Amino acid sequence: ETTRLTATEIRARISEGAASREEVVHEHLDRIDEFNALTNSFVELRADQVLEEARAADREFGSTLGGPLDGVPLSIKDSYSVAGLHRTDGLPVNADVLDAQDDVATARLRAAGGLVLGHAGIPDLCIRWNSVSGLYGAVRNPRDLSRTAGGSSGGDAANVAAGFATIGLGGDLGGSIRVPASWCGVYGFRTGPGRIPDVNPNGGRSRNVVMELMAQIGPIARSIDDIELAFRIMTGVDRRDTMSSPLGLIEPIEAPRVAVLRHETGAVLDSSVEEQLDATIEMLRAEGYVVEENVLPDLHRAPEVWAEIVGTELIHRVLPEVAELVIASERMHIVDMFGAYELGADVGAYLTALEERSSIQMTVAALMERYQLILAPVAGMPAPPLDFDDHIGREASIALFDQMRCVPWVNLLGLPSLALPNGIQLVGRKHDELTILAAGRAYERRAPRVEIATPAI
């Protein structure tokens, strides 16, 4: 039953002598053993190794808690190095990549006492809203096994939603935290520029700054307290990441005004999503926020410019290098969807798109001085069937992109955003993470508490 509990509640049990760390870990591992065959969400376990950590801490500390994550089991996305685990990007060709060292973000979670159970499932290359890999197969939604878990952090979202771990760690370049979190009915927090360093001491490939500006690390959890705890532990400068900053956290702003994004990026929304947006508007208003509809300009270009920039790179640089190493469904997702938006081979087109990005960014930054939070859908539909994006072709891929238009503008503009379990998100300005989490509590105080799913056919 610690599988149903938040970090604070688990630590309370440990503090009172009601459970040992070893017992907490055993409960999660037993649950994983019972149901992970169905979800396929923990793809590489370190069961023996984490049990050793738990027992060691029990022997040394007993019911005294050490660091602020002592006793809390974690899921980590395959992409983030954990010393002694493999980092594969889903690809069989990388099955031999075994890391000697943690990434900085993972190191901080572990140094604080976090008990990493294993690596979580992902799509090949981490470029998909569906966590299907050549090495591990498909992650299924624990809330309904016929449905996608989302992606690219689908494994972590699924592990948290199923009670396999208390907190997960993902990344978000095009919705990789927010999409699976919302589709699995949990919280997912995409942090903002400067806070959490992305440092891999094992040696990563080197990236285009344009892509790095759109990507951030963040936690997935079943409560905002757990989101905040993981966020605070991971935040801090490391000068090995050029985009990391020594800037401290900024206290939540008094009385931010909230703008509603509904159709202003051209998204095609299900009635159920429109109804969740309406409900979330009213939760914020009841909390005392001023929330305004129909105040944003026409921003249909924002997700399109994201797809142009990302798609051009995927089609003209990435795919030529990795085409034969990825599963057919990954290749064809990139061709079918990003092929609709990629700008061709002329550098002049790519440069023009980069200028448009800056123009949109300027417009939105100016308006967010007035509307410091934007409330928006995440996906335009609830979790779709598992094969929703598998060899669906150009026309259907454009229709999918249209359903997801409230997602990737956030990445384009480099903004933090909290995805709520009901598929709505709170987007804030750069550096205003704590304002976002405060607003999130307006939802948390009113919506039913997140409960773990028991996967069943």
Added chain:
Amino acid sequence: ETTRLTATEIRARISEGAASREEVVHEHLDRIDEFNALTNSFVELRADQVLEEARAADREFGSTLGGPLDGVPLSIKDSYSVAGLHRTDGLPVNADVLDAQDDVATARLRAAGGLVLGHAGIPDLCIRWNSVSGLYGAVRNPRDLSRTAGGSSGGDAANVAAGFATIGLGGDLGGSIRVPASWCGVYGFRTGPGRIPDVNPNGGRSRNVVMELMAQIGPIARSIDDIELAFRIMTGVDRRDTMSSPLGLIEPIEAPRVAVLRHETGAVLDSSVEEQLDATIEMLRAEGYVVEENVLPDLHRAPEVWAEIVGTELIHRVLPEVAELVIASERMHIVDMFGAYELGADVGAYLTALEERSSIQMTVAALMERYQLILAPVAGMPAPPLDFDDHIGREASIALFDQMRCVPWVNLLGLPSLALPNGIQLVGRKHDELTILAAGRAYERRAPRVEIATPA
């Protein structure tokens, strides 16, 4: 007399009752009237309006000093909006672009009491190490009128070196502060990421983030105190610039080690420049710095990657749009020089260059954890003749680029750097501006005082 003085000294004259603000402004405007025909460095004045400002302050305040730049005459590069002045980018087609509002950096200088005398000369598009425009012609070096003032902030540097203003405001994407400051024998401080916001409320042309990451605003002046004063006044978040940060200034590092960059970026250096580098090494050693030579790796790709990234954009995006609007020497500088490095039309090559930028940045960031300051030449030669880059062709442009190889790597990697009046610079890590300025002061304690030139 106030034309020779630093900001602190001018303000002391006002405090003493020895000069009014109006008299300070008159002395500078009179000097401009006498010599600006030779330098062509102040290209548009607001003489009546700035005298009005000085008189209003004199009436209300008398010898009481107001804000921290009260009484201090300023030069502002054409590129940075000043309310009531035109912003032309040197192009006759833009001679009617009149701004209603200050840029944020300009507004902060003015709000602090600074007295903007006018706009300073520039090259067409601000893409050149020589401040030659279609609208205003050539800025000439006040220290030697046969020589370039540098660019693209050549007007501001010349104005400060000639005593037409106390402090100037420029920008630096490929040396635009450091090159003209050094060639005019004054200080020029390229600030680092996050510090000074670049916000034009009148509507600036939108720019590629890649270029924006390499560009920073900063002051030109005749002392470190004046550099620091202007720097601190302009620093502060403005969220309209998404690159600006609320991060404060960081106190100078205790005992930073200094790495010497001489030939490691492939630069071809004059003997006089090598000797200025040696002299500065000894000045810093005498002030207690540990300075080490031959500690840097082979960084010859750093300036090349800058030229590839910049050049590809200039050739494939900028020139197609403005080719008929710029003087032929500006067009041909781009073709002759950047044409040697541009990557061609394939987006794949540009993406590859972007990846290499990140790799170099990470390598240099790691080594600057040990060597927190890099000491380097700016240009490989003292200020060249005014025609040095005028329709020179491909081979000559490669030779010129090789002479300038210690300059643009700083931009590529997003680093702050102070150019000293002798053509040497002090480069620091991101956010470490005050450590740089401390080392600048060490130079200033050992070197001759900067004096203004009288153009003749």
